[PDB]
């Protein structure tokens, strides 16, 4: 259950080496408006692939 | 699928009405007994006028199982109630004369041919 002695700050950083959050590669541009959005998502202004979907 | 402590009925008229399997003969760590398989039994309930009494440790052969035997055609014949024919402890020959009810054609071999030439159905 408990440790026999405490780990180092080195073994702590090596453990946290795999915790880096991936960035989004690039946001895509809509054809009509030009606003950035995620792929396969609608924009904030409700456009998807050049079509006004939500009011 | 007769294992030990299974209570079987008796197919012939040896005198017992109810026997219990105490050992499935043939092979180390053997679990079950099908139709072609000798079992060692004890006698739990007998008729008062029979050939064998209560507490006799002897051999028997299973003739009917509720699990049922499978034919090579893909078929399966499942009886109702488990049954055995009692045998002589060393001679391997049956004790009673008449045998009640059906048996299987899986049983066809020399000593059980002596058995199977007595049954009404096969």
């Amino acid at each position: 259950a408990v440790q026999q002695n405490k780990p180092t700050r080195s073994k702590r950083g090596m453990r946290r080496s795999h915790d880096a959050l991936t960035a989004v590669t690039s946001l895509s541009v809509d054809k009509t408006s030009g606003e950035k959005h995620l792929r396969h998502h609608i924009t904030a202004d409700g456009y998807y692939r050049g079509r006004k979907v939500i009011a | 699928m007769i294992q030990e402590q299974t209570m079987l009925n008796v197919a012939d008229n040896s005198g017992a009405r109810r026997v219990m399997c105490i050992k499935v003969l043939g092979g180390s760590h053997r679990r079950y007994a099908g139709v072609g398989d000798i079992i060692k039994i004890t006698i739990k309930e007998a008729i008062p006028r029979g050939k064998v009494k209560k507490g006799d440790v002897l051999k028997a052969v299973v003739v009917r199982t509720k699990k049922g035997v499978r034919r090579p055609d893909g078929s399966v014949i499942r009886f109702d109630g488990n049954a055995c024919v009692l045998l002589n402890n060393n001679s391997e020959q049956p004790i009673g004369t008449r045998i009640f009810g059906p048996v299987t054609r899986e049983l066809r071999s020399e000593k059980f041919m002596k058995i199977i030439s007595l049954a009404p159905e096969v």
Binding site: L38, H41, I54 | -
Partner: protein
């Protein structure tokens, strides 16, 4: 181990799932566009599209089956009167999913599910 098994459990039991799908099908037929989560939107596709296929023939028995699967007579009225003659041409695909970001509270994947009329 789930090999070729459909249906999502959605962290509910069977009665809660069935009642939740009945409520969502009522809200979708009522408002014609609803916001929900993404897997609930996919399961809602598999629930609400047979009702629209049931509305394609208008009889007493079919309206009673639609009432048995929605329990709202205003919903079965709107189905058999509006969504029946409107969706009569297209064969399947009466609905449309569109992903819309993530929820602010629990970071849940959002979606709009709507009918193909608007």
């Amino acid at each position: 181990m789930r090999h070729r098994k459909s249906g999502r459990q959605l962290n509910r039991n069977s009665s809660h799932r069935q009642a939740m799908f009945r409520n969502m099908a009522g809200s979708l037929v009522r408002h014609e566009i609803i916001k929900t989560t993404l897997p609930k939107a996919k399961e809602l596709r598999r629930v609400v599209e047979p009702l629209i296929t049931l509305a394609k023939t208008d009889s007493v028995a079919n309206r009673r089956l639609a009432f048995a699967r929605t329990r709202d007579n205003e919903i079965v009225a709107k189905l058999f009167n509006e969504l029946g003659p409107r969706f009569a041409s297209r064969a399947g695909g009466y609905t449309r999913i569109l992903k819309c970001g993530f929820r602010a509270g629990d970071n849940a994947p959002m979606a709009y599910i709507e009918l193909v009329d608007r």
